[PDB]
Every structure is written in C-alpha cells, then in structure tokens.
Amino acid sequence: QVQLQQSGAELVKPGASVKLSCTASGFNIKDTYMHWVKQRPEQGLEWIGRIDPANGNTKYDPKFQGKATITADTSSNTAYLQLSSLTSEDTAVYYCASYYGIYWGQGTTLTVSSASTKGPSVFPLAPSSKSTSGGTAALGCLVKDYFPEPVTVSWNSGALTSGVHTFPAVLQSSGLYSLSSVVTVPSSSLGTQTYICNVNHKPSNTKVDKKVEPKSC
C-alpha cells in the first residue's frame, strides 16, 4: 500500500511558530513535488506552495511568501510546513499532497488560541436504555468538555464502521466542545457482541477506550 501520514492536530499560541509534518509510506522522493494546502470552512482549498525533495527547490503562492516555509528530508521521507507569526487567520486544516495530486494526507487541524487544551471525559450511551427497541438498538459514546477540536472516534479499533454517526461538536457556554458518536446494532446480539469506542483528542494527548454495554437494573 501507499499513503501520506500527517502530524496530529494541535493548539498553538498567537505569535508563535509551528511545524507540521507529512511522512510518506510506500513511495518516496522519486515522485517529487510535495504540496501543502490550507482549508477553512466556507473557503475552498488554498495552495500554500510546494517543494521538490530532490533538490530542495520551493515555489510559493505569493500570499504565503513571508508566512510559510516548506522543507523536506528524503532520508526520513518527510516534508515539513513551518508557519510563523501565528494569528487567528492561521486556524485551519492543512493538507499535504504528492505529485499530480494523487495522494493526499488526512489533514492536520491547527487551532491558534491563547487558551489551554482540555482533555474530554468519555461516557457510555448504553444500548436498550430502559428496555429493548423494535429489533434495532442504539449505543454510543459522549465525548464531553474538550478544547480545541477535533476528536477522533473509532469503534472496535476500526472493525465497526457500519451504521456509525459521529455528530458535529457543539460549543457549550463554557467554551468547551461536546459531541456524540452512535451506532445502531441488532438488539438480539447485545449479549454476544462487544462494542468499544476509541476516542482520541491529540491536542491534549487524551486517548480513551470505553466499552459500551447494557447496564444492569
């Protein structure tokens, strides 16, 4: 297989600098040209620049000429995007892309803020709450009180993806986010199958695995 793995999401203070990475697996320098793209809601994709790992040559979108610096290391097969003098306008998702734009990284969410990071508390949303439903049952996890976004939620370490809905986070009056991830499953196998949600909030290095099962009463 082949893909581009980008560094984790993070929060950085205004005025500071940060360096994002994009490591390639499968291919390497041979393809040449590693591009960096910026994206914000209601704003399309914006090209920052690109680098030729073979000779270190770089080309930038004029607007980023004094804001972004792209570097590459063929040995470790990694490209870096250094952003300086961070401002609220730098809060976005950054994507790295290979030659011809065939391979794209999963993106890195950068939040510029003067606030502290906050790890979430993960609570189970047990199936068959009081009693069983008409054939199908729902279950999930409540990821509450975290900052900033985003949070990654998997089920059974990737083994469960069918019928999953991870809702957009809501901003609570405290300035902290909260979201839920739910799954609909057969009610008949609640006693035989195991469902565990895998939560990860990179900005605070919080990683939680919560087994969601029907509670006794």
Binding site: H35, G44, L45, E46, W47, G49, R50, K59, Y60, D61, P62, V93, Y95, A97, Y100, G101, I102, W104, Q106, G107, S121, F123, P124, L125, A126, S129, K130, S133, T136, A137, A138, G140, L142, K144, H165, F167, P168, A169, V170, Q172, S178, L179, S180, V182, T184, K215, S216, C217
Partner: protein, 214 residues
C-alpha cells in the same frame, strides 16, 4: 494568478440524475486541469486530470470535458456516495489555483427518523452533571423538531443539538440532542422524554425513560 471560477457554489440533485459542474479559467491553461473530490470526512481524491482523463479505478459515471476556457465535470447517474465538495485544480502555471468548489447535495424520499433516548451514565452522575441524549436516526429531509419534556414540562435553555451532513450510503441525516442538567436537578424529576416532529411522521413520536434505582 489564474482565477478558477466554479459554478454553481451548491447543487441539489436527485439520485440517478445527470449533473454537471463547471470551472472557467481566466487564462489559457491548455487542458492542465484536475477534478478533486472531498467527502464529508475530509478525504480528498483526484477523479480527473488533463481535463478529461479519468484516474485509475474512478467510476465510469464521472467524465470531464473542455470547451475553450470552460471545463466541466459530469456525473451520469448521481449516487449517494457522490455527496461531496468538488474542486477543479489548475496546474498549468504557478501559483497552483483551485476553483471555489461545488457542494453536491442529494435529494431523496422522505424518511421517518428512528428515535432513541439515553439516560445519563452512572459515572457521569458521580461527577455532578447529567446529560440526557436523544437520537433521531436516518431521516429526510433535514428539517426536524425535538422538544425536551421533564415530568411533561417543556424544557428550554438547557439543551444543544447537532445534525450531521448527508450520509454517504443512503443520503439521510441524523440529529443528536443533549439535555445537560446538574446531578441534583436530574434527581429532582422522574420522567425524561424527547418529543420528535418530522414530515415522515403522521404524529409526534415521544421516547422516554423513568430514572429508577439500579
């Protein structure tokens, strides 16, 4: 910079419909244009390059064409999986430029939501807070009303809801509503209910639970 003007910004289309998106280059780009697709999860993939050449593995329903400075992407039979934002990319000169993007929305039949209600977990209760969650699963259209009722009394000021984007499989939406109360306030009442109103229902559907000792 070569400006890529993409239209329309948003497009709503029924399943099986033949749709097209267009990008007009402000400069001669000689066919050096790619079409990229970004799904709800942030995943970006290239569908076409050289204006009309389909990438390996790209479904035949996708096709690109050129007529002067007008570059179009056409989808023969719109499928639920096609729900995404499409961007044209100019790679003829520097700096590389993207079109504004076209948000493709999917029209489908009215579907009634399956409602579920969840009590606060015991471990959360230990922390002094209680979040009651109401789930409206797989419905269409997006419009829906959810009302919280504690002991039959309508609630206001203590809830937050969030709706997903259209599902990649069936084009439906799902809504989650959370009623957050303090442990003390939670323990003060018995019946917690969620009343849902949606076009796919002849009458409001109410789901509830009674906080009994376990």
């Amino acid at each position: 910079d070569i400006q890529m003007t993409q239209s329309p910004s948003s497009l709503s289309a029924s399943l099986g419909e033949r749709v097209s998106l267009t990008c007009r280059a402000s400069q001669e780009i000689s066919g050096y244009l790619s079409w990229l697709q970004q799904k709800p999860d942030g995943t970006i993939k290239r569908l076409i390059y050289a204006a009309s050449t389909l990438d390996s593995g790209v479904p035949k329903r996708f096709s690109g064409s050129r007529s002067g400075s007008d570059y179009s992407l056409t989808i023969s039979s719109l499928e639920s999986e096609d729900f995404a934002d499409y961007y044209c990319l100019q790679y003829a000169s520097y700096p590389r430029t993207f079109g504004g993007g076209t948000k493709v929305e999917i029209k489908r039949t009215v579907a009634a939501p399956s409602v579920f209600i969840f009590p606060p977990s015991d471990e959360q209760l230990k922390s002094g807070t209680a979040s009651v969650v109401c789930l409206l699963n797989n419905f269409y259209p997006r419009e829906a009303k959810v009302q919280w009722k504690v002991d039959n009394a309508l609630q206001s000021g203590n809830s937050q809801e969030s709706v997903t984007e259209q599902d990649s499989k069936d084009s439906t939406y799902s809504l989650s509503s959370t009623l957050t109360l303090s442990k003390a306030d939670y323990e003060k009442h018995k019946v917690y209910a969620c009343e849902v109103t949606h076009q796919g229902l002849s009458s409001p559907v109410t789901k509830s639970f009674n906080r009994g000792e376990c």
